[PDB]
Write a protein that binds this ligand. Structure first.
Ligand SMILES: OC[C@H]1O[C@@H](O[C@@H]2[C@H](O)[C@@H](O)[C@H](O[C@@H]3[C@H](O)[C@@H](O)[C@H](O)O[C@@H]3CO)O[C@@H]2CO)[C@H](O)[C@@H](O)[C@H]1O
Ligand SMILES: [Ca+2]
Length: 386
C-alpha cells in the first residue's frame, strides 16, 4: 500500500545508502532482522534487495573506558567498522568510512579529542590523525572491503579532534584527506557539516575550506527536516557550494518518524513539540520525507551524488515496558545511544542522558525487525509506485 512519486531527474548511479552502525551492538543484544517474506535474514542482504547500494559506518578511535567498557552508541570502533564493511561488500554495497576522530559522538557541540591525543601538541596530533586514518584504511583494504568514500570528520561545524581554530581544523582535514589519497585515488574524500538553515553557514564554511586549501571532493550535509529548515533551502545552499567550489554534494544523514510511539522505553529524539513536521508521522509520511530529500539532492543537478538514511534499523532491544531489563542490554552491549561508562568522556551529555535508542521510531523496520513498506522507497524513487 506504499506510494512513492518518481523522483524527477534522478541519476541512475545515485547513491542510496544507509548508516547501520548500531547493527553489531544490536545483534549482540539478541535483536534480529527479517525480510519481506518474514524470514530471519542478514539485514545487509535485505538492504541490498531493497535497492540500497552504500553503507555508512561511524568510527570512534577508542569508544571505551580504561577497563574496556564500551561507551555505547554501538561502540563503533575500527573493528566493528571492518565487520560492517565485510558484510557491506559481501552484499554489493560500497562503504563510507565515517571517522569522528573522537572517542565518542562528534557533532556541533562535541568534537572532543580522542583520549590518546588528549595532550599531544598540535603537530603530533595532526600526524596521529593522519596515521590513524592511514592504518584504519589499510586494515579495511586487507579485509577486502570495497571503500567508496571516506568522511574526514563528522558534523565538524565548530571543531575537530579538540581543535576549534579553523586554520588548525583545515590542517587536520588535510591530514585525514592525505591518508585517503595515499590509500586509493578512487576513494572520495568527504567533509560533513550540519545545520544548513543557518543563514550563510555553508557558504562561509566552503569559503574557509577554500582559503585553507583543504583537499576534499564531497561537501556532505546532515538533513533532519524537524530542525534543518526547508528542502528548498537545502538544495539552495548545497547547489551554491557545488557551483562555487566545484565540489560534489550529498546528504550524509537523514531520517523521519514513521510512528509517534517510543518502542524501547528511552525517550525518542522525535517527534517533539516545536519540531517541524511537514509529513504525517506514518509509514507513508516517512517515505515521503526520504523521497523528498532524494529529490532535493537530485535537484542540485550533476553534483548531487546521493543520500544516506541515518540509522534505519536502530530498533529496540526489547519492549518499552521492560525498561529495566532493556537497560541491562544497553549497558552490556552498548546497543543504546550511550552507556553510563561514557560519563567520563562526556559528563554533561551522555553523563546524564545515557540509555537506549532515541530513534527506534525513525527506523525503516518495525520494533520487531520486519521491514516497513517504506523501505521500498529506495527502489520506487527511480520509477514510482504503479
Ligand atoms: O531521551 C530523551 C531526551 O534525549 C535527549 O537527547 C540526548 C542527547 O542530548 C542527544 O545529544 C543524544 O543524541 C545522540 C548524539 O549525541 C547525536 O549527536 C546523534 O545525532 O544522535 C544520538 C542519539 O540518536 O541523544 C540523547 C538521548 O536521546 C534530548 O536532548 C532530550 O530533549 C530528550 O529527548
Ligand atoms: Ca526509544
Amino acid at each position: 500500500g506504499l506510494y512513492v512519486e518518481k523522483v524527477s531527474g534522478l541519476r541512475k548511479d545515485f547513491i542510496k545508502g544507509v548508516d547501520v552502525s548500531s547493527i553489531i551492538a544490536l545483534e549482540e543484544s539478541g535483536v534480529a532482522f527479517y525480510n519481506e517474506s518474514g524470514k530471519k535474514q542478514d539485514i545487509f542482504k535485505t538492504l541490498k534487495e531493497a535497492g540500497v547500494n552504500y553503507v555508512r559506518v561511524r568510527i570512534w578511535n577508542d569508544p571505551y573506558d580504561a577497563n574496556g567498557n564500551g561507551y555505547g552508541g554501538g561502540n563503533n570502533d575500527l573493528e566493528k567498522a571492518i565487520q560492517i564493511g565485510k558484510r557491506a561488500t559481501a552484499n554489493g554495497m560500497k562503504l563510507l568510512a565515517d571517522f569522528h576522530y573522537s572517542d565518542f559522538w562528534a557533532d556541533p557541540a562535541k568534537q572532543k579529542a580522542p583520549k590518546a591525543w588528549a595532550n599531544l601538541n598540535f603537530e603530533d596530533k595532526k600526524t596521529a590523525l593522519y596515521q590513524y586514518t592511514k592504518q584504519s584504511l589499510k586494515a579495511m583494504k586487507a579485509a577486502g572491503i570495497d571503500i567508496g568514500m571516506v568522511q574526514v570528520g563528522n558534523e565538524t561545524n565548530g571543531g575537530l579532534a579538540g581543535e576549534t581554530d579553523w586554520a588548525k581544523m583545515s590542517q587536520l582535514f588535510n591530514a585525514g584527506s592525505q591518508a585517503v589519497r595515499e590509500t586509493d585515488s578512487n576513494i572520495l574524500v568527504a567533509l560533513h557539516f550540519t545545520n544548513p538553515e543557518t543563514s550563510g553557514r555553508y557558504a562561509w564554511i566552503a569559503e574557509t575550506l577554500h582559503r585553507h586549501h583543504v583537499d576534499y571532493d564531497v561537501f556532505a550535509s546532515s538533513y533532519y527536516p524537524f530542525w534543518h529548515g526547508t528542502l528548498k533551502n537545502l538544495t539552495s545552499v548545497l547547489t551554491s557550494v557545488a557551483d562555487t567550489y566545484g565540489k560534489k554534494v550529498m546528504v550524509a544523514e537523514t531520517s523521519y518518524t514513521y510512528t509517534a510511539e517510543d518502542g524501547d522505553g528511552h525517550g525518542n529524539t522525535a517527534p517533539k513539540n516545536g519540531q517541524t513536521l511537514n509529513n504525517p508521522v506514518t509509514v507513508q509520511g516517512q517515505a515521503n520525507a526520504v523521497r523528498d530529500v532524494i529529490q532535493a539532492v537530485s535537484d542540485v543537478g550533476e553534483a548531487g551524488i546521493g543520500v544516506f538514511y541515518w540509522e534505519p534499523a536502530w530498533i529496540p532491544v526489547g519492549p518499552a515496558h521492560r525498561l529495566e531489563k532493556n537497560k541491562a542490554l544497553w549497558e552490556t552491549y552498548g546497543s543504546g545511544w550511550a552507556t553510563s561508562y561514557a560519563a567520563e568522556y562526556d559528563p554533561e551529555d551522555a553523563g546524564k542522558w545515557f540509555g537506549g535508542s532515541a530513534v527506534d521510531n525513525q527506523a525503516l523496520f518495525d520494533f520487531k525487525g520486519r521491514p516497513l513498506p517504506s523501505l521500498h522507497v529506495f527502489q520506487y524513487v527511480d520509477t514510482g509506485t504503479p
